[PDB]
Amino acid sequence: GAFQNLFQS
Amino acid sequence: QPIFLNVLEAIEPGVVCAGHDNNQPDSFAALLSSLNELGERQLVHVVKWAKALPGFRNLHVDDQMAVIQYSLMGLMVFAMGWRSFTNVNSAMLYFAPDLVFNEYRMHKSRMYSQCVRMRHLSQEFGWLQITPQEFLCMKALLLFSIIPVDGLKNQKFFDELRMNYIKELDRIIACKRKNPTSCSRRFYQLTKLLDSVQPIARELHQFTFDLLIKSHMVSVDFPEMMAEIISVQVPKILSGKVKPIYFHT
Numbered sequence: 001g002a003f004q005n006l007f008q009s
Numbered sequence: 010q011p012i013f014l015n016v017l018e019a020i021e022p023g024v025v026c027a028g029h030d031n032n033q034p035d036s037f038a039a040l041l042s043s044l045n046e047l048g049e050r051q052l053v054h055v056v057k058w059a060k061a062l063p064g065f066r067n068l069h070v071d072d073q074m075a076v077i078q079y080s081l082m083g084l085m086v087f088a089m090g091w092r093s094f095t096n097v098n099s100a101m102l103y104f105a106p107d108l109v110f111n112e113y114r115m116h117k118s119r120m121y122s123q124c125v126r127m128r129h130l131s132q133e134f135g136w137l138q139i140t141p142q143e144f145l146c147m148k149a150l151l152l153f154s155i156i157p158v159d160g161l162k163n164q165k166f167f168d169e170l171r172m173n174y175i176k177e178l179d180r181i182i183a184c185k186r187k188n189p190t191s192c193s194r195r196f197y198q199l200t201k202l203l204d205s206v207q208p209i210a211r212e213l214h215q216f217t218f219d220l221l222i223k224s225h226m227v228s229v230d231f232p233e234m235m236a237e238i239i240s241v242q243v244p245k246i247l248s249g250k251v252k253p254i255y256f257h258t
């Protein structure tokens with residue numbers, strides 16, 4: 001979700 | 010050198026501003042919308058900080074994400090208690106340079122009870138004379154202070170990391186050494202202080218959960234990312250599925 005994609009960049 | 014302490018100071022994040030309109034009169038919706046936005050901003054910096062911590066990449070990617078989310082509130086509350094101590098000697102709550110709470114705001118936000126607990130925590134830094142070094146080591150230990158009761162994916166590496174952060178904080182505690190009355194007691198004091206972050210983060214979790222639930226009916230905006238964390242991870246804490254690791258009983 002939204003946090004994993006933050007975690008990604 | 011003091012390798013470990015160097016790293017903690019090197020990665021410690023800068024000032025994060027909330028973007029709040031300090032010339033509008035205070036309403037609940039504005040204060041809470043500014044806090045939700047600041048919450049997301051500080052979360053972005055917490056991810057970067059955390060990923061740079063010694064050993065953090067020993068953890069399974071999934072344990073990494075989970076401890077960030079679970080420990081977010083305790084972390085922000087602790088950093089904020091320190092900022093209030095250093096910036097205003099604990100008279101007000103220094104969420105951000107552009108979002109300082111006086112008693113009127115504490116009350117308009119409808120989080121007075123939680124705010125008063127936070128101010129107390131802030132005074133404690135004074136009372137105990139916490140050094141900037143002890144602060145940094147304690148804050149680092151808080152990212153490893155809250156886990157699912159059913160354990161993590163690679164729990165053994167977590168256990169080792171945490172043990173090693175406990176060690177570093179013991180190595181660094183402030184005392185005249187030829188007396189472990191100070192050193193053994195200092196540790197006691199600091200671990201009591203760390204424990205007390207948890208009920209406060211729990212009250213704040215409870216209030217934010219409730220606010221998300223009724224948010225449409227009170228005009229508070231949650232960033233999409235905060236909405237997901239509140240609805241997906243927050244309730245594991247409130248339901249007892251994820252729990253703090255306490256020093257004392």
Ligand SMILES: C[C@](O)(CS(=O)(=O)c1ccc(F)cc1)C(=O)Nc1ccc(C#N)c(C(F)(F)F)c1
Nearest residue numbers: 044045047048081082085086089104217235238
């Ligand atoms: C009400 C709320 O905005 C909720 S939130 O930021 O969306 C949030 C959502 C999920 C979490 F796991 C933690 C925090 C909040 O707790 N904000 C907030 C923002 C900044 C700071 C600081 N500093 C704090 C506090 F911890 F210090 F209270 C709290």
